[PDB]
Amino acid sequence: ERMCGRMSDFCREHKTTLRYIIWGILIAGYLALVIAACVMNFHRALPLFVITVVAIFFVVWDHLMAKYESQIARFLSPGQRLLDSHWFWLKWVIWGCLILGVILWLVFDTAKLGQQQLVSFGGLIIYTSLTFLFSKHPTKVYWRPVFWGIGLQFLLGLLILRTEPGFMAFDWLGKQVQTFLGYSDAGASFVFGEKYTDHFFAFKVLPIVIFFSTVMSMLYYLGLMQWIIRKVGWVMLVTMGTSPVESVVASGNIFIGQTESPLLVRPYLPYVTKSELHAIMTAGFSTIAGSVLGAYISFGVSSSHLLTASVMSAPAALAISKLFWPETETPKINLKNAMKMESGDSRNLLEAATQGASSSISLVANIAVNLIAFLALLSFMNSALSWLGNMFDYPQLSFEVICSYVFMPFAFMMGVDWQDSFMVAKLIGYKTFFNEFVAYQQLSKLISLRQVGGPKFVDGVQQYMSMRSEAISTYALCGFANFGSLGIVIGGLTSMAPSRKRDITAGAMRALIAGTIACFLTACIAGMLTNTP
Amino acid sequence: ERMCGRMSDFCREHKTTLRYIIWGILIAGYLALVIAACVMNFHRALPLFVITVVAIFFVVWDHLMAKYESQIARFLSPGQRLLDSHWFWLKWVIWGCLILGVILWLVFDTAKLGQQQLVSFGGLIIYTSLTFLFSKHPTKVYWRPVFWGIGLQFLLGLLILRTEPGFMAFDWLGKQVQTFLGYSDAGASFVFGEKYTDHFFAFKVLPIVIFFSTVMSMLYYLGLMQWIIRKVGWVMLVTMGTSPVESVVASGNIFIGQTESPLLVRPYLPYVTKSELHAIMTAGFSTIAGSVLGAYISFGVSSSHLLTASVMSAPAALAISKLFWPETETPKINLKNAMKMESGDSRNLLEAATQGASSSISLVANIAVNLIAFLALLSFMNSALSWLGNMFDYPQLSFEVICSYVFMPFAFMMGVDWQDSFMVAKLIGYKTFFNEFVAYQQLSKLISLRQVGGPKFVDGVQQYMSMRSEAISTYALCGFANFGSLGIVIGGLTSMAPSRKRDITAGAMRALIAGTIACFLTACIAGMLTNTP
Amino acid sequence: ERMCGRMSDFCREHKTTLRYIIWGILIAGYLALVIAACVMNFHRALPLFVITVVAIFFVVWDHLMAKYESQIARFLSPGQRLLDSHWFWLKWVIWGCLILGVILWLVFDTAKLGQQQLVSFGGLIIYTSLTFLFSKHPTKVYWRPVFWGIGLQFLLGLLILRTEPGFMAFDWLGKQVQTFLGYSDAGASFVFGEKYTDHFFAFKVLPIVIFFSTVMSMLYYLGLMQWIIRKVGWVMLVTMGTSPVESVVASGNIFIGQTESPLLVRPYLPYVTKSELHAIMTAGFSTIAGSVLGAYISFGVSSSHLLTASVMSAPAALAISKLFWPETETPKINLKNAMKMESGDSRNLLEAATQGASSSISLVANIAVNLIAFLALLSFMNSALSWLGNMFDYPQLSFEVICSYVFMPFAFMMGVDWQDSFMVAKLIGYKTFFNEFVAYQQLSKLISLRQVGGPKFVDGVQQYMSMRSEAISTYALCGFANFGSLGIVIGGLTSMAPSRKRDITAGAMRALIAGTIACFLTACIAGMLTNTP
Numbered sequence A, B, C: 001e002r003m004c005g006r007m008s009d010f011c012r013e014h015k016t017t018l019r020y021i022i023w024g025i026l027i028a029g030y031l032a033l034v035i036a037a038c039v040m041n042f043h044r045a046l047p048l049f050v051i052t053v054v055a056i057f058f059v060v061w062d063h064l065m066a067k068y069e070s071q072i073a074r075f076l077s078p079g080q081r082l083l084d085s086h087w088f089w090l091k092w093v094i095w096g097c098l099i100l101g102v103i104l105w106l107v108f109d110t111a112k113l114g115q116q117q118l119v120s121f122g123g124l125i126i127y128t129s130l131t132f133l134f135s136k137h138p139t140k141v142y143w144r145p146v147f148w149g150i151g152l153q154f155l156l157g158l159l160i161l162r163t164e165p166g167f168m169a170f171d172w173l174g175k176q177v178q179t180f181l182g183y184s185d186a187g188a189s190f191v192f193g194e195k196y197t198d199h200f201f202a203f204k205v206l207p208i209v210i211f212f213s214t215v216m217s218m219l220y221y222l223g224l225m226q227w228i229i230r231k232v233g234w235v236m237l238v239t240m241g242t243s244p245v246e247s248v249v250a251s252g253n254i255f256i257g258q259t260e261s262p263l264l265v266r267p268y269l270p271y272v273t274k275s276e277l278h279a280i281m282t283a284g285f286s287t288i289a290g291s292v293l294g295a296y297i298s299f300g301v302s303s304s305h306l307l308t309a310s311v312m313s314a315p316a317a318l319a320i321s322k323l324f325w326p327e328t329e330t331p332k333i334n335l336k337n338a339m340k341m342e343s344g345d346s347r348n349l350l351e352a353a354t355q356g357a358s359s360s361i362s363l364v365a366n367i368a369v370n371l372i373a374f375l376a377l378l379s380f381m382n383s384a385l386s387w388l389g390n391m392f393d394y395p396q397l398s399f400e401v402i403c404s405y406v407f408m409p410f411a412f413m414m415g416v417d418w419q420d421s422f423m424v425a426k427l428i429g430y431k432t433f434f435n436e437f438v439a440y441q442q443l444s445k446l447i448s449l450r451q452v453g454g455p456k457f458v459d460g461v462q463q464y465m466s467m468r469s470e471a472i473s474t475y476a477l478c479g480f481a482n483f484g485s486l487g488i489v490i491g492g493l494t495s496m497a498p499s500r501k502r503d504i505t506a507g508a509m510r511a512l513i514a515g516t517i518a519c520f521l522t523a524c525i526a527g528m529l530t531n532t533p
């Protein structure tokens, strides 16, 4: 096989040029398709052109930043030195301008909107103050991350809620997801037949979870998830001044669950501080995963609000963690180590899809079994309470009544009016004790009742609430913070870092509370910007 | 934070008094509720008052026994010395009185009831004699546990079957369970829809198993299960003279499965004797779990009889184990070590509920798959036997016919009349080979046919049997002794105690046989007391 | 217990004779039943007599071969020496006779049948040549196994397709399986109710997989599977000259999956060569399992063709593996070590049934989830392609069109006519990317459309194809070679042999390609013998 040996030698000699030429040819073919499509019709081919343009821009930008990093840093250094020189007097001016802007915004927008928005602002202040009072180290507090996180949340809310561009962008993004979750119906129909709608939840909702997990694993294989995670983490790190590890984990928990997000930085867990570990757990508790998003949307919960809350939950999580448990040590991990994220052991895209599909079995199984047990326990508890309540001629006693009269202040501070606060408190209880699959399920019923348009009150019982309250509840409930999740979180984090078991158990409860508080802060910011119809 | 430090110091200084005061306040509130309810109406608040009274009595009793144990023992010692002094001649008197009582009971009750009850007594004697003949060490037999276990079974049967108080108590207890298993319908309806009754077994029965496992895990977390287990084990230990480990395991297997019951004494397994290990396996094989109770009740099997059999199966298991495999070594474990039972790694009640729910996935999955395979094999076997039977112009040959003509003597000795013995033998075969989920399922069909009231015989084929036979079959079938369970039992017990693998394999078959024999003994005792309608 | 000791001593003294006498009595009883059945009626009892006769013949043959092996070998040796002496000139005569026979068969059968059969022969030649060109070691090729495997495939095809005896035998064998898979309906009906047909796939097809896995585990416990495996492996080893390990694995993969077949030789995996490992993987990729056979038959795929393809896939796998990756080392394992296969840890038949049933849970779960994900991805891909295709006024672009225009040459070489090649290419794509559960599912639709008898063309779209194309597709698609299976195969084989991880990853892709090529070779041989209706 002399010819075969010569061919192998030729391939070895110019391996780099051959593959580069092949990739260039593929790129040229794609560009030819795009340009031909634009030529035949432009209005019809606009989205493809836009996608290609943005991809090209990002590729060029990344290449330039990687290549000319040192030159750009050197060019920026003089301005940084001048700003540091004049900061001792410029800080007061900047702070005064920001405070004046806050005051003007309040006076000219929030007061016009009404009283409930001012109550939302007051609730924000009150939650922050309460977190400060019960802090682990109240004296050793670094206030930069707190203010920066709250400001980032406010800016995101302004751009997405009070501007036509962001509103349109996020509505479109939500609509695309709603279309995307409809593809699982093919597999559900084949496996479970054309009668798969006889059992809506089991045979139509869970397949959405399966499909979303598959797609997420495929995206992780390709590397887009890590790209977006790094882009967001750099912003949060530069503005807020947090450590790279916690910033990366917070940015990744927007898309990934609390248990699987620490895997982004597996090797460096034994060397993190207590504060970073607490921030990791808090970020896990203050966000949801992309797999369960489709189920919540199927129930009827707004997609745009869910995405907005997931985005806003990260700065709030980091700020609340830093205030609740500030840093009193020296971090060891550096930016390059944190940003590098080890992709999985998948040889090709289809293997990644299979791996993602297989992992979803336990998820759906546990979801179903826990729902069964929780609802059975709820029924038993309500029956027992009615039995006890009949002694005092009050057989209407129930879990819902107690929770409505208990969690009312937390909902009132978020800006919910007096009447609907008692209804939001029930959802808060459902989430606090059982989980968020139940709270969103009841919220969907309330939304459907409003959409139907029946009587708001029947026999003096409120049947549904307003749009603003529904949005505020959507923001408040977006989290994984329940008493049950504490054990599984601790177990997983110990399994990843056996040596840090003593530290993990110490901060888990504070992390859970901080996650709940962060959800409430996001809800308050939402409420102070939405208007009363 | 000087104020915070002062508050922390104050909390540390008087930590004990603060929590004690809080608990006292909670207790006072509960008592205030109880007394107010009684004041408003007494007949309506009676059960709450009774529950509170019994709880108070048991708490006070436990405190007194723990505090004044030494004084009570010293006070009792003189009487024990006197009894030991006079025992050498008093033993004959006591034994003669007991024998005379047995004879009088036989003559004046059993003969009046009829012949079948005398046959039941004879079957009891015969099973005991057969266990003696095939004993591992016939010469080294300690007869105290045998007689004491049989006597405890007889006393329990008298109190629960032949007295209005016990009959009413256990009927009420059974009715409460039937009400309790109806709460799972809420979760089943949500997860599987309002059409969940289209698939009765899968979508209504298994959720009962899930809910019961959840409740059992919660009770184990609270500590009531261990309380009852210790109370029963002390009685069995004092009366029968067995070792603490086997007594505890037998008392715990009333509520817990054979695989999970040894976990009550995990550390001490390597140090147990062969006899104690055999007793453990026998107790596992002679009882059922509380999770599968609801399914059997849903089929239509009597709850009171199931509870009575589960209670009676422990003394029989221990007696049959001691007779089959008596003790020839010195036990090492002591009472304090055995009674202490390590609760699980659950931080709160809801985490315990989640853990219990998750563990139930494998249980129901295996139940369903094994049922599918066993019924398919049964159909294939029956078709093949009919094919073989057609050669001799007898195409009616089947598994049921062979089992009816094979297991008939075992059912006849239990007191089942001649006609119904052939029908009970089929259930015995179903249980011996496949499992008890099948035997109870067929028994439920027979019971339903009787309740309908159709012809007892159609074309010379008996369609149903009497009430007494159904009760005797309920007692006989209450066990986990099947040829399949041998492997899983051995695997689990080796996984708990790897070093004792050689001993575990040796006694497993004898334990299985002893469990079957114990079930039959319970059935014989039931039969000799029930009357022929 | 002196009598017991005497009985035990007597049993120990003559243990061998007692059990032998018992087995002889059982055999005599069985023979008495057989003879009585024949006496009462012979035509009715014929199959039982035939089964008994063949069993007796095989038992006697095995005993004689085991006992008189040395004498038979010595008797055969002289002829072997004479043949070796005259081989140097007799080889040319034998080869010329074989070539002349091939030429005559072509001229007088294949040409008469038509052009497509000649195209099938040419495709066979072309696939072999392509495997030779891209071989790992083209110079170091041992041609005996290649020709012998192709010849064995041709002989099997002649006996099973072009002779009434083999045709009848395999049709009968297929019909028995179709009857056998109907027994699972009992378990499916009980567990999932009389409405289990509302969800055909989930509640009727997967139980077939469960039941077949149970039966396979039972057969492995009994030892028939190993008997047949050894019988086939000896033939393949003697004729082809392959190593015992790869021959055994290839013979066992007819009935067993790719992951579980290497367990037949677990200990010797670390000591195999690279070529044997490659052959193992190739055999795994070129065959199916007996558990999934029932599902394919339920869809509507021919049973006889499936069995024939499974039988023919082993010689092709070995030949293609030897040509693609020939042997350049010295094998270490010997025949006695390879043939001995360690049965599982099952004490009795029912325990084996339970073990087989439990293992089937993961199989069906993964099947269902992967199907859901794959079909959802297919729908999304088709929608996206239609969106892209509308730019050029061609909204009909799809995965199916691309695959039809891509895989067409591979189907044309197999002998499929011009029109149906584009349809077979779609099935090839479905199998190559997703899996064979999808390709057979679509093939069943095509077969059903033909059976209905509607218009072959509607609006210029072909709705179904011919019988010959359906058979060729049945042969082509019988394999587990998909891009997804690469990862699971590698993981399992590394878990069995951790030390050989470097070698396993190297040959997996070549093994996958070789499996596909072997399937195509079987299809070509099928096509060159079937006639055009």
Ligand SMILES: C[C@@]1(F)[C@H](O)[C@@H](CO)O[C@H]1n1ccc(=O)[nH]c1=O
Binding pocket: A256, A257, A258, A259, A289, A291, A292, A367, A435, A436, A437, A480, A482, A485
């Ligand atoms: C965290 C949860 F307990 C949730 O509370 C429950 C309700 O969604 O499901 C669990 N869950 C969900 C998604 C995920 O990715 N990981 C995970 O553990």
Ligand SMILES: C[C@@]1(F)[C@H](O)[C@@H](CO)O[C@H]1n1ccc(=O)[nH]c1=O
Binding pocket: B256, B257, B258, B259, B289, B291, B292, B367, B435, B436, B437, B480, B482, B485
């Ligand atoms: C022991 C069993 F094989 C039973 O025979 C079968 C039928 O109930 O289910 C198994 N089983 C049931 C309850 C339990 O707690 N543990 C357990 O293993």
Ligand SMILES: C[C@@]1(F)[C@H](O)[C@@H](CO)O[C@H]1n1ccc(=O)[nH]c1=O
Binding pocket: C256, C257, C258, C259, C289, C291, C292, C367, C435, C436, C437, C480, C482, C485
């Ligand atoms: C190999 C497979 F990926 C198949 O491609 C898929 C479609 O049948 O199921 C998997 N499978 C099937 C049978 C078996 O025995 N083992 C196994 O892994």
Ligand code: NA
Binding pocket: A252, A253, A254, A255, A256, A257, A258, A261, A283, A284, A287, A288, A289
């Ligand atoms: Na998350």
Ligand code: NA
Binding pocket: B252, B253, B254, B255, B256, B257, B258, B261, B283, B284, B287, B288, B289
């Ligand atoms: Na038990």
Ligand code: NA
Binding pocket: C252, C253, C254, C255, C256, C257, C258, C261, C283, C284, C287, C288, C289
């Ligand atoms: Na196979």
